[PDB]
Structure 1
Amino acid sequence: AVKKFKPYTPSRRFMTVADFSEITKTEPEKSLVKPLKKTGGRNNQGRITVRFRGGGHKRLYRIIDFKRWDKVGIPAKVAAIEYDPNRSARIALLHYVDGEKRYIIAPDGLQVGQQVVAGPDAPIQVGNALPLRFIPVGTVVHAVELEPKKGAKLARAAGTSAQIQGREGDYVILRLPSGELRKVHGECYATVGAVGNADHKNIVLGKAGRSRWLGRRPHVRGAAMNPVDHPHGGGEGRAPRGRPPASPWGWQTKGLKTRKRRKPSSRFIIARRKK
């Protein structure tokens, strides 16, 4: 579900929020939060290196467990499902029988009180971590490591998932959310299921103010600038691009492939993204 508002204001008319019904606890585990140093887009030089950012709501980085093989064979009870402002996805608070508490990206279909486990011997059930070589081919999977013991990298965003399409030696064949077919190492941990909160993409911000809340400052069209600023600058009255459409830095923004060609990871990428 995605909550809709009656139009008692101009922007309430299209504004929609999440349903938040999957959420059980409304406070973060103090043991597991750390302050998030906001960057405002600027680097260590003080210079903006990513534009139109800052002024977002104050947020508190919940530490997430992307290793999960950190505790093999040791089970855990899904204690609560919480809101994480630091990501599209929802997080689950795991009470390990070890006593240790941890956060994991909450898969779709998790249950408050259900128990999960990481390990090769682990069952093929929701929210269970295994190396890929022990996961059945065809089974949907999320939060995939890219290399062994380097932490989950792929399929972490809300609703996203990857599907195993077969094996080949030390490596297996994954269909990443993009649709790219890639060889991931068979010894890479992954968590069966798909990321929850799949309704995320169907959220209408509704107003200019909501974008600001998310730390997103207003964007400015190249066309709305002058020649010193943008390639699309100047022009008396409005104007077409008058050149191939380009970035502020001159490089072409329509169709031009920018991935490095001789990148060694090409050997493990089968099919480039589609659509």
Structure 2
Amino acid sequence: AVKKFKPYTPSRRFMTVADFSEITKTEPEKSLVKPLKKTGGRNNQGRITVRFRGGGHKRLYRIIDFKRWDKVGIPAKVAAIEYDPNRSARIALLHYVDGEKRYIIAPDGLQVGQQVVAGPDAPIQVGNALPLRFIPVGTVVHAVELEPKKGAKLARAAGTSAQIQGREGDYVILRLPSGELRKVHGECYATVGAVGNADHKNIVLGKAGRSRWLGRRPHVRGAAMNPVDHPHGGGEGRAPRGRPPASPWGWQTKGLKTRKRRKPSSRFIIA
């Protein structure tokens, strides 16, 4: 729904926040499965290797289930929709009949009290997970494995989906959130429906702190540095790159394709 604020301050004029209808009636996360402390840390063995990352609210990690084929045939009730700091989509805590609990990346439509289940048997309805073969060609579907038994890799950003496009032997044609068209193995599970919290794209951050709260440090333009510092760097008063735009590292950044030519991922992709 996206709350918009009255301008009792500049900046709070452009800022908009999420509705939280979404999740209601459950905030403190599930002490049990949920938490491992999450490790803030914006680089590897010494050196920063992602620029401009750091700061931002101390944050606990919710351990979700991206491999639902453990619990084939066991249904579970959807117990609550709760807030996840660690991703754009919201999550649903569901108690399996099994006793056992886990978090699924909460698909659109899903509502407290629903029962949900995974297997080749499963009804073709919201939140249920299934091999791609036993899912009807045309349905949209998210949290898709890419190789069988490897965990859900596709379609987990808030409001994403993929669509079953066709069959083809052990394999099955898939239109991805990008627009790419990719064969994925029939045994690769996927959960019917799309992702939801799909207003997520429309938050207007609103000011430059906040950007900080989410741990995004300020990003200094190329020209804006000096030549030691960057390709664009230099120039007496203000400058026009001076051919052709480039990362700090030098490699071209307007139009240059980067994916590896002879990748065996090829032959599976088609867009």
Q: What TM-score do the two structures reach when normalised by structure 1?
A: 0.95
Conservation of the 8 A alpha-carbon contact between 1:41 and 1:49: no
- Provide Cα deviations, 1:164-194, integer angstroms capped at 9, x if missing partner: 0010001000000000000110100000000
Conservation of the 8 A alpha-carbon contact between 2:137 and 2:166: yes
* CA positional deviation for 1:44: 3.2
**Structure 1 pair 51–36 and aligned structure 2 pair: CA distance change class (3 A):** farther
* CA positional deviation for 1:29: 3.8
* CA positional deviation for 1:34: 6.1
Q: Percent identity?
A: 100
Inter-partner Cα distance in structure 2 for 1:88 and 1:240:
37
**Structure 1 pair 101–37 and aligned structure 2 pair: CA distance change class (3 A):** closer
Any idea what SS the aligned residue of 1:43 has? coil
Q: Kindly report the root-mean-square deviation, in angstroms, between the aligned alpha carbons of the 2 structures.
A: 1.4
User: How many residues of Structure 1 are paired with residues of Structure 2 in the alignment?
Assistant: 271
Conservation of the 8 A alpha-carbon contact between 2:143 and 2:154: yes
Conservation of the 8 A alpha-carbon contact between 1:35 and 1:59: no
Inter-partner Cα distance in structure 1 for 2:39 and 2:86:
14
> 2:170: which partner in 1?
170
More helix by share: 1
Any idea what SS the aligned residue of 1:102 has? strand
**Structure 1 pair 40–100 and aligned structure 2 pair: CA distance change class (3 A):** closer
* CA positional deviation for 1:55: 0.5
- Provide Cα deviations, 1:215-254, integer angstroms capped at 9, x if missing partner: 1000000010000011010111100000210000000000
- Superposition misfits of 4+ residues, deviation over 2 angstroms: 24-44
Conservation of the 8 A alpha-carbon contact between 1:32 and 1:102: no
Q: Which one is further off, 121-130 or 32-41?
A: 32-41
Inter-partner Cα distance in structure 1 for 2:54 and 2:260:
30
**Structure 1 pair 187–86 and aligned structure 2 pair: CA distance change class (3 A):** same
Conservation of the 8 A alpha-carbon contact between 2:142 and 2:194: yes
* CA positional deviation for 1:153: 0.2
- Provide Cα deviations, 1:5-47, integer angstroms capped at 9, x if missing partner: 0010001100000001111344344444666666666433121
- Provide Cα deviations, 1:51-87, integer angstroms capped at 9, x if missing partner: 0011010111000000011100000000000000000
The aligned runs of 1:13-28 (5 Å cut-off) are 13-28=13-28
Conservation of the 8 A alpha-carbon contact between 1:125 and 1:192: yes
Conservation of the 8 A alpha-carbon contact between 1:74 and 1:117: yes
* CA positional deviation for 1:267: 1.1
Inter-partner Cα distance in structure 1 for 2:99 and 2:35:
24
Is 1:265 the counterpart of 2:265 in the alignment? yes
Inter-partner Cα distance in structure 1 for 2:40 and 2:220:
17
**Structure 1 pair 32–262 and aligned structure 2 pair: CA distance change class (3 A):** farther
Conservation of the 8 A alpha-carbon contact between 1:33 and 1:60: no
Conservation of the 8 A alpha-carbon contact between 2:29 and 2:82: no
Conservation of the 8 A alpha-carbon contact between 1:246 and 1:254: yes
**Structure 1 pair 153–170 and aligned structure 2 pair: CA distance change class (3 A):** same
**Structure 1 pair 126–38 and aligned structure 2 pair: CA distance change class (3 A):** closer
Q: What TM-score do the two structures reach when normalised by structure 2?
A: 0.97
**Structure 1 pair 94–185 and aligned structure 2 pair: CA distance change class (3 A):** same
Conservation of the 8 A alpha-carbon contact between 2:81 and 2:91: yes
> 2:226: which partner in 1?
226
> 1:214: which partner in 2?
214
Conservation of the 8 A alpha-carbon contact between 1:148 and 1:189: yes
Gaps of 5+ in 1: none
Conservation of the 8 A alpha-carbon contact between 2:142 and 2:162: yes
Conservation of the 8 A alpha-carbon contact between 1:39 and 1:54: no
Gaps of 5+ in 2: none
**Structure 1 pair 33–220 and aligned structure 2 pair: CA distance change class (3 A):** farther
The aligned runs of 1:115-154 (5 Å cut-off) are 115-154=115-154
Inter-partner Cα distance in structure 1 for 2:141 and 2:208:
36
Inter-partner Cα distance in structure 2 for 1:232 and 1:220:
12
**Structure 1 pair 46–38 and aligned structure 2 pair: CA distance change class (3 A):** farther
Any idea what SS the aligned residue of 1:166 has? strand
The aligned runs of 1:62-211 (5 Å cut-off) are 62-211=62-211
